[model samples]
Target: SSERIRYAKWMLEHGFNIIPIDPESKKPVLKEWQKYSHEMPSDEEKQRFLKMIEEGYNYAIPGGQKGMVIMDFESKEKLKAWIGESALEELCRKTLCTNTVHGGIHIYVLSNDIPPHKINPLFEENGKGIIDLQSYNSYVLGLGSCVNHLHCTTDKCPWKEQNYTTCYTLYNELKEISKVDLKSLLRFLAEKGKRLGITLSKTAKEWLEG
Candidate 1:
């Protein structure tokens, strides 16, 4: 099988909704990708993707399509920094992580009852923003794609390995974090958020001071 077909099929098998994008410009090739974001593509749809890849187009996959959250990070520094202070290994130790072509990475977390939130860019020090918590209905550059350069899974990334998924373990662990106590939650964010340019919410701040 061709790389495109193999990659697309692998993603499909794992429940990822894939779509083609201009490999150089990183723009979507489809008219309305969101329409098909959650639905598993048909054979004809996969063939269309195959055609796009043959024509040098890359791909983007929908995050949170099915109870998944994709954390998009421009640099590993802030993401890794948050990981360090929050002890996020409990979350990443067994989750699917994807590294992008332009030195960004996507970390995955799943929850059946994830809240709906807009995917907004996070501010970083100097200029480049570090992370974007792409919650439900957000899109992320697909794995094994290079928007302008070569994008492939790594042997040494944040979690110490390349594109990998250990979802079942993570899903359960995330549930615990989702239910974290108010005081612990405030402490964790207050102590850890600064590392990733994260700040306490109004409620969190008030609770912390009180």
Candidate 2:
């Protein structure tokens, strides 16, 4: 085994369901990967999956397992622009964050209430990038996974200097994932949305009030 297996084991131990991913394409290798989203693999099954990872396949953890939700930010500028500097600071202070190879950030929060959805181009006026609310059925490339620099078009990516591949790195000192109050989170988002003239989906509004 390699560092990939080590990371996989760590994720499994943390209660996240793992998916075998193709290194180049970044897609899951298993045709039935969706099954893992609902139920974690058994110990015997995990061993076989780890064996695949040992053979060079990368791994991803399906979000929403164990109430995990990843706020995938396309860029720091966009996130700050939308959430404001103070809120972004507080968010980073509270969550487990990771830096993407593409110069983005993945902020992990545990909440069972927020549904999985991709808010592409979170700001309608800018059209710069998007933020992804990765939960239920979505998966994020796990720690120790490397992405090719060619796939990254972000300007001034710090990782480009480190050869052709960049590994996902920790963005904060707190490596532990923290649970969040979904109602408060949603209310905050709703307030921001109102200020930004962005409308929340009816489903989201219901969740906030529920």
Candidate 3:
């Protein structure tokens, strides 16, 4: 597929534009795209990324599911990301205010609306359907997590554990270390995990390269 730019360009011009839709349709839309690329790039890059995405998107066919949504506990460092092109300073200012734990919301950004795909920029995670930059300081700013100290699901945080739903755990191991190499951070953690008897997945690294 990569050999022919014409086919790629045709797909780019018509298919997979990142138009917003009702949040409830998310699961099904992903299902429809079952094996399509999740990374909806500009008119130029769209074709290229789709070529890479097509390789595995079809895994959902027959009995399996591609463009499927799955969630689980991920490393705090792994969850560190913003929805899209936003200023870091602006993000820092929009931190939640209800409790003194003033920190900006973790994004459930929908990069590529495709499911089962986050392999790389092939998928874009836009925090819910939020596209307005002006709403930064409102209640909409914080990632929605309910805490009652009651019959809560958060002996486990629904925010953190609700994978198919949007979420991130920014509070996980955030440290203000100066001049730290990010590649080294996960490497160090992985090495540590080995000693602690666990294994870390290499998917994030793969995504970065993709």
Candidate 4:
């Protein structure tokens, strides 16, 4: 079948809740897509997704399904500056990473210890977007999907100058998503925040301790 269908099947078989997306709009095509964030798609739903892929639709995976925690980096430079180059390199090597269409980075890890929570976006002192913890009720586009240039709205996006369609591609050889200690990761972030003079939200502190 199509690349999207094949990748969708692969993701489903590997325990990801992959769903259909509109290529132009980059939005879920299913009205009840939010439900799949908590549960796997039924067999019928899987077939439906495959059909949609066959009809030229793209695909994406919702966060918090199968203990997913996607560390979405809006700017690699900003992330490296905030977390340091060594930490960024180590994370990229340790997790399943994807180079996003918008010239950003995505690090996929599993953490059952982390409860479903709202999407958290970290920022620098100047209020620039840094990284987003796409844990629960959030989604990331799957590989083998192409999107138009207009899909990006971030200022100074690297891919904005290019008029060609962009696709999500694997960034590392680590095909398997690694499971991490969510609390420890949060603690690391908290410590980093203290040193950098960045403040973690109350919810982040509670999550770190709880």
Candidate 5:
């Protein structure tokens, strides 16, 4: 309630799309949130959203806005371990990632022309959940959502300012960076998996993070 209006307004100013959700259930308050997922509400409408938060409601940012998507991991440890795998570290260096109060990490990636979609556990292990893909019809808990609160250990990172960017920009700029930047990094991970790697075949074109 206290920070809802300000947070929502700030997000809109920054080009982030948002929606209201239930504080407890964490579901969208409006069943038709998707119809407006690509838009920023008007000032008066934003006030109405604030009123909802005043009543203990929550908010979310649909991942599909402008081809934005997040790679959600359960915690820092798992995130570190998983990305340590070959090629994963290569991707992280170019992406803008954040920590969640729920002990998770959100890796932001963009697909300019690719349509957004969801994969709760894009990858899994023995039924235990790991990564959750939030995009398209999927909505990520927003700035004031209690269930998935914002958090950062870095002073410059978790600040009065917000840290965010589109996925395509991250991908493109990183391409211009010299491979020398990650030579040692790739070698380290490659050393561990070189022998155990399995051969794979691609029948067609692949997407980002393939």
Candidate 6:
């Protein structure tokens, strides 16, 4: 309550709209999920996520999961800028890729992995991302614009094309980008939300840091 404003701003800045899981109960938006995110996510979580963001300390957006073993920096401004885009989404892409699937326009690439448990324990949210079979797989997989499920659309099919393909596609590019521009940023996040099925564990964070 004392830090309601601080908390609220943090939530919005981090890509969470702060929707109350149950409005009727007067709950503080995704009560259960919020509680889990409080779990000692990292040794530096408090200093980095809360201290820096909450107190506006140094205004740096530190990126790392509980299991990242690698420490590499492209620049300061780029790192913080991506945080404002989507934490959950970034987690998704980091865990499991969303390419190799077929049928979609806009060519969704999956990235930014945020599970539902962060805010709600009851709900099971897994991380997932999309790759351009031709776009991502070709360069990443050496397939060269190969479209199987990554790029194919049928009106009869209920799912929309381009939406899922862009998930991983966006992150793969955005996280790699240094300077943040509006049009470029929006284009990067055009397909931020793609439900590819995968799970990134705390160990992944360790691995990155290792």
Using TM-score as the measure, which candidate wins? 4
Off by over 4 Å in 6: 1-82, 85-139, 142-144, 150-200
- The local lDDT score (0 to 100) that residue 39 gets in candidate 3 is 42
Model 5 per-residue lDDT tens digits across residues 1-210: 255555555556657667778655557877778866577667887778867866766677777666666666666565456446444555656665555545566666665543333334544444454566676777666544453223334443323233432111122222211212222332343354334441111210122233
Model 6, 23-98: lDDT tens per residue? 2332222233333322433344433434332332211111222211111212223323433345535543443222
lDDT by residue for model 3 (89-160), tens: 332233311111122233222122222333322111222211111111111211122122223245334344
Model 2 CA deviation exceeding 4 Å by range: 1-3, 84-86, 116-129, 151-163, 190-210
Clash pairs detected, candidate 5:
110-167
- The worst-scoring run of ten residues by lDDT in candidate 5 lies at 198-207
Instruction: Please give the TM-score that candidate 1 achieves against the real structure.
Output: 0.63
TM-score of 3: 0.24
- Give the residue spans of candidate 5 off by over 4 A: 1-6, 54-56, 85-96, 113-120, 148-210
> Which is the winner by lDDT between candidate 2 and candidate 4?
4
What is residue 182's positional error in candidate 1, in angstroms?
A: 14
Cα lDDT over the full model 1: 0.55
Best by lDDT: 4
Residue 81's lDDT within candidate 2 is: 64
Per-residue error (Å), model 5, residue 196: 11
Q: List clashing residue pairs in candidate 4.
A: none
| Alpha-carbon local distance difference test for all models | 0.55, 0.71, 0.27, 0.74, 0.52, 0.27
Q: Tell me the TM-score of model 5.
A: 0.58
Q: Higher-lDDT candidate among 3 and 4?
A: 4
- Number of the candidate with higher TM-score, 3 or 6: 3
Better of 1 and 3 by TM-score: 1
Clashing pairs in 2: none
Using lDDT as the yardstick, the better of models 1 and 2 is 2
Better of 5 and 6 by lDDT: 5
Q: How many pairs of residues collide in each model?
A: 0, 0, 17, 0, 1, 61
Q: Per-residue lDDT tens digits of candidate 2, residues 1-210?
A: 455677778778778789889766668987678788779778888888888788877788887777887877767665576679899778888877878767788888987565545433333323333465777667888777877665554555655544587777777554667888866775676577566654555544554455
